């Protein structure tokens, strides 16, 4: 070919791909910008 190509990376990784995929059945696969770890003790502050 003539590019470079991401398809040999993941014929690699198959095996692991299958295992992980079978065990994240109850997980939540992904993750969501807003939770961080210091926003559970913050106080918001609004001024007008």
Same mark, same amino acid.
């Given at each position: 070919? #003539? !590019?470079? !190509?991401?398809? %040999? *990376? *993941? &014929? /690699?990784?198959? %095996? *692991?791909?299958? $295992? *992980? #995929? +079978?065990? &994240? #059945? !109850?997980?939540?696969?992904? $993750? =969501?910008? +807003? $939770?961080? %770890? /210091?926003? +559970?003790? =913050?106080? #918001?502050?609004?001024? =007008?």
């Amino acid at each position: 070919a #003539k !590019n470079m !190509n991401v398809r %040999p *990376l *993941l &014929n /690699y990784f198959e %095996p *692991l791909f299958t $295992w *992980l #995929k +079978d065990q &994240n #059945k !109850n997980s939540f696969v992904g $993750w =969501s910008t +807003d $939770w961080s %770890p /210091y926003a +559970d003790q =913050s106080i #918001k502050v609004r001024i =007008s």
